[PDB]
Structure 1
Amino acid sequence: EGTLEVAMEYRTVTGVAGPLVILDKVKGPKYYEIVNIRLGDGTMRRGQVLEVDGEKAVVQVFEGTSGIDNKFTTVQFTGEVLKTPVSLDMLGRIFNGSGKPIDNGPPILPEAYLDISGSSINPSERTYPEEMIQTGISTIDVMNSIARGQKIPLFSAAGLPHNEIAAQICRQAGLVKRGEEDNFAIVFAAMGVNMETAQFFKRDFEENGSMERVTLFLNLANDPTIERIITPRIALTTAEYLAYECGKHVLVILTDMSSYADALREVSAAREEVPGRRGYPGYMYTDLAQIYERAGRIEGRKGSITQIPILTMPNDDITHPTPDLTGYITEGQIYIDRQLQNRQIYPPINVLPSLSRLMKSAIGEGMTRRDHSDVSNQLYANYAIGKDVQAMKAVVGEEALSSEDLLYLEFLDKFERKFVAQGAYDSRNIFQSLDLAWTLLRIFPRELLHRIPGKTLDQYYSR
């Protein structure tokens, strides 16, 4: 091997402003070379070199630029991009936003260093998702299903129980099983959460007994804002290593996707870049793509990555740039309703916008029923017509609902009452739920049904 070399140690910082430290007289820089700045007081912090020009090099530190002296701070060039020591032993532990251990345990002994921001899977190599996932929630598996490799987020405004829903999904997660060594190895990114929520997550995962197969990546709001952006990267790097190069399927969870976007806006505004909508950086589509567009089933390997992010509509508006880009990229969405939450429904999923783009392949002959697609279509379409009936009744009166409209309103009411609701630990299997789903479909006349053919449901039999 070519002879080793020790890192250069510079002191020529020649200007500081904002989150940027400017160097000079640098001999042989490297773009995105990771630098570990040591201040005069002796403390250390890291950062990235975002631009290289001439002998100059512009560094954006991690822990902030406070307390840096233009004549006493020393910069060292590791000469490599950021690498996370991924290993199989990383399971069942917790880490800070930067990945430092926080589980009162020893640092990870790496099997092999893997550069984060890894190269894309060859598009030809990528294969379509084909197997359903038992998240442990009824309404997700019954309609708007999930395939083992399909990405789909959870849309939920502020104040909604989406974090509790994520915890329930993580603890109740499992394969359909219709094994354990290669079973779901859940990676749980945590991008910018409150300390109370962090303690909630830690206690829920520790007590659940799933800590034997789950790795957390906690990052609080008190952490440096830039450290928030590398978190959902380190998490996906570890997920890629565990799934593709280690075999076991991974069900990655990202929390507060909006917080990552806020972390991006702050960093970009500091960098003084061209702004997109709402002042968010223009290339956010690219950087949300680099995060989302990783889950999938590579052909040459039996692993599988499944992506379940959680967003947060800032103004409770789906037209906000973050949900807009997500819905452009993420292949479907699960929607949570504030009004249904007000109606005291624990899983307040609003089925009208809750669609799975890959549900057509999630259903099949290996799993579900031959009428699953038709039942989903009917219970997804008649709900909108029942909502329109409710609106017409509101704008005219109770007598406005005719013999057909009244049936739609009753269908909507019974649907919001029985089918959607579920227990806090309800593993309602597909068939028992689809029975009452067809009961709801049969609340409406069995011949008035327009889209569905009666023979498809006739393949199924009542009782």
Structure 2
Amino acid sequence: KEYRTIKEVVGPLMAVEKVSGVKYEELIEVRMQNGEIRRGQVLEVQEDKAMVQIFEGTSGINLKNSSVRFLGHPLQLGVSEDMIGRVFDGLGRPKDNGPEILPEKYLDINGEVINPIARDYPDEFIQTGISAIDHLNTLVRGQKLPVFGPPGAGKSALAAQIARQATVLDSSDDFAVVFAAIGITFEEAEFFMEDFRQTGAIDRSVMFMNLANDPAIERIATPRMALTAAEYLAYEKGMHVLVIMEDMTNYAEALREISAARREVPGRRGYPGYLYTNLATLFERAGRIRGLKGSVTQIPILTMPEDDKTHPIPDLTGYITEGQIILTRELYKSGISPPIDVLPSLSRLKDKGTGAGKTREDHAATMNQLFAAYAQGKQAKELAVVLGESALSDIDKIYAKFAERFENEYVNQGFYTNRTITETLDLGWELL
């Protein structure tokens, strides 16, 4: 039943009267007086009145001669195995002009919370082919390992590279990739999409593309769309799914904007104050489930502040994540691709992902003292800029040169070279 009872429009918000049976977070359709149809969501419901928000805004609407239909369900994803190779927008609607998907079922994109005793501990090793990660900051299935970087420092290039050369060692059980673009530009999106098509990786990928000029309210739905598809492929088809989301900083900003538009109570830095709730509800959606085959692994991509806080505070993210992968600008100016500063980078779960029966057995030991060559390699030369010519030169003579090699060849793989882990270890020993 359409309701012809719109009484108030203030900004993107609408007040509808004399409804009954309307539920919180229920989706609506506005049928405008000119025949246009917009999609929306119930944000408050009170006696016989409902307050909704229109995804496309309210510009052009005439209240008296428009109507609202209450669809009787929230934001859902139509899921199917056929989502592999396809490209959608932030709401799961096709962006690739391709054949239509007949969903197996529709799933609430908010998800369920895993019972803690049903969860399984992260175990297997993922070969990103990036030596700087695979060796020092090893990625395990079920982990949440974010990467932080300044703008245009190739962090997105790194993202597409991990998406490219990510695999498991048995590789009997397929590795699917779910990619979520969160409020990025058309050109960034095209980088990801056309790369995915040229390397063929699209054949094992599902893409959710929300652009910098899409409605912020849809930007809020995008990561949950990605993760619902990911959990469906993992726990209902037995797949091992890797989830990449850039840029989560944009997700933080869209949250701030929506909360402002809804005259809510501002928390820290005007950010909604439920950033921990929201980001944790997103990031804790990774892992393994005892008794099921698949897995979900997340790699969020964040813009690092490099300024007066006023960013999606990492401490929040790092408080929920199991590690940090840091890119700095000074490695990008040197031409180092990928520019990972191994020193503040951490993998909270590298331990039981790497070991005997999982990787070559030098791996650990060389890691646990390969940091040390870089630790005292730049402890001399970078610190002693003033005293550089002679202070600590006769002794510790080579500890600079080997650090230069660590940057120049060990970590400067190139954004298009796939280093097998054992190959990486060979380079690691030759550098020593």
**Structures share fold, TM-score greater than 0.5:** yes
Between the aligned partners of 1:275 and 1:379, the Cα distance in structure 2 is 46
1:439 CA displacement = 4.8
| Matching of residues 264-279 of structure 1 within 5 Å | 264-279=255-270
Between the aligned partners of 1:69 and 1:189, the Cα distance in structure 2 is 35
Which residue does the alignment assign to 1:288?
279
Question: Aligned to 1:159, what secondary structure does the other structure show?
Answer: coil
Residue by residue over 1:428-448, the C-alpha shift from the partner in whole angstroms, topping out at 9 and shown as x without a partner, is: 2223332443454x5xxxxxx
Question: Aligned to 2:191, what secondary structure does the other structure show?
Answer: helix
Aligned counterpart for 2:205 among listed residues 214, 234, 237: 214
270-279 or 382-391: bigger deviation: 382-391
RMSD (CA atoms): 2.0
Between the aligned partners of 1:326 and 1:184, the Cα distance in structure 2 is 25
1:357 CA displacement = 0.5
Aligned counterpart for 2:132 among listed residues 122, 129, 139: 139
Between the aligned partners of 2:159 and 2:312, the Cα distance in structure 1 is 23
Identical columns (%): 58
Which residue does the alignment assign to 1:258?
249
Q: What letter matches 2:21 in structure 1?
A: G
Larger radius of gyration: 1
Between the aligned partners of 1:429 and 1:212, the Cα distance in structure 2 is 22
1:100, 1:107 within 8 Å by CA — same for their partners in 2? no
Residue by residue over 1:393-452, the C-alpha shift from the partner in whole angstroms, topping out at 9 and shown as x without a partner, is: 214342222555545434432322232121333222223332443454x5xxxxxxxxxx
Between the aligned partners of 1:278 and 1:381, the Cα distance in structure 2 is 38
Between Structure 1 and Structure 2, the one with more strand by share is: 2
Aligned counterpart for 1:426 among listed residues 393, 417, 420: 417
1:307 CA displacement = 0.5
Between the two proteins, the alignment pairs up a number of residues equal to: 432
| Matching of residues 398-437 of structure 1 within 5 Å | 398-401=389-392, 403-437=394-428
Aligned counterpart for 2:290 among listed residues 293, 299, 314: 299
Between the aligned partners of 2:343 and 2:380, the Cα distance in structure 1 is 15
Q: What letter matches 2:278 in structure 1?
A: D
Q: What letter matches 2:222 in structure 1?
A: T
Q: 1:413 to 1:291 in 2, by over 3 A?
A: same
Between the aligned partners of 1:219 and 1:147, the Cα distance in structure 2 is 28
Between the aligned partners of 2:195 and 2:383, the Cα distance in structure 1 is 45
Question: Aligned to 1:113, what secondary structure does the other structure show?
Answer: strand
Which residue does the alignment assign to 2:53?
60
| Matching of residues 363-442 of structure 1 within 5 Å | 363-401=354-392, 403-440=394-431, 442=432
1:155, 1:313 within 8 Å by CA — same for their partners in 2? yes
1:298 CA displacement = 0.7
Aligned counterpart for 1:311 among listed residues 291, 302, 309: 302
- The reply on whether 1:152 has 2:145 as its aligned counterpart is yes
Which residue does the alignment assign to 2:332?
341
Which residue does the alignment assign to 2:178?
187
Question: Aligned to 1:14, what secondary structure does the other structure show?
Answer: strand
Question: Aligned to 2:216, what secondary structure does the other structure show?
Answer: coil
Q: What letter matches 2:90 in structure 1?
A: G
Residue by residue over 1:79-104, the C-alpha shift from the partner in whole angstroms, topping out at 9 and shown as x without a partner, is: 22221111111111111121111221
Question: Aligned to 1:81, what secondary structure does the other structure show?
Answer: coil
Question: Aligned to 1:309, what secondary structure does the other structure show?
Answer: strand
1:316 CA displacement = 5.5
Which residue does the alignment assign to 2:343?
352
Which residue does the alignment assign to 2:237?
246
- The reply on whether 1:93 has 2:86 as its aligned counterpart is yes
264-273 or 206-215: bigger deviation: 206-215
Q: What letter matches 1:131 in structure 2?
A: E
2:109, 2:228 within 8 Å by CA — same for their partners in 1? yes
Which residue does the alignment assign to 2:38?
45
Q: 1:20 to 1:428 in 2, by over 3 A?
A: same
Question: Aligned to 1:263, what secondary structure does the other structure show?
Answer: helix
Question: Aligned to 1:226, what secondary structure does the other structure show?
Answer: helix
1:63 CA displacement = 0.8
Q: What letter matches 1:256 in structure 2?
A: D
1:261, 1:322 within 8 Å by CA — same for their partners in 2? no
2:147, 2:302 within 8 Å by CA — same for their partners in 1? yes
Structure 1 residues without counterparts, runs of 5 or longer: 1-7, 443-463
2:16, 2:50 within 8 Å by CA — same for their partners in 1? yes
Residue by residue over 1:206-245, the C-alpha shift from the partner in whole angstroms, topping out at 9 and shown as x without a partner, is: 2222222211111122221211111111111011111101
Which residue does the alignment assign to 1:448?
none
Structure 2 residues without counterparts, runs of 5 or longer: none
Between the aligned partners of 1:24 and 1:198, the Cα distance in structure 2 is 41
Between the aligned partners of 1:422 and 1:315, the Cα distance in structure 2 is 25
Between the aligned partners of 2:355 and 2:29, the Cα distance in structure 1 is 53
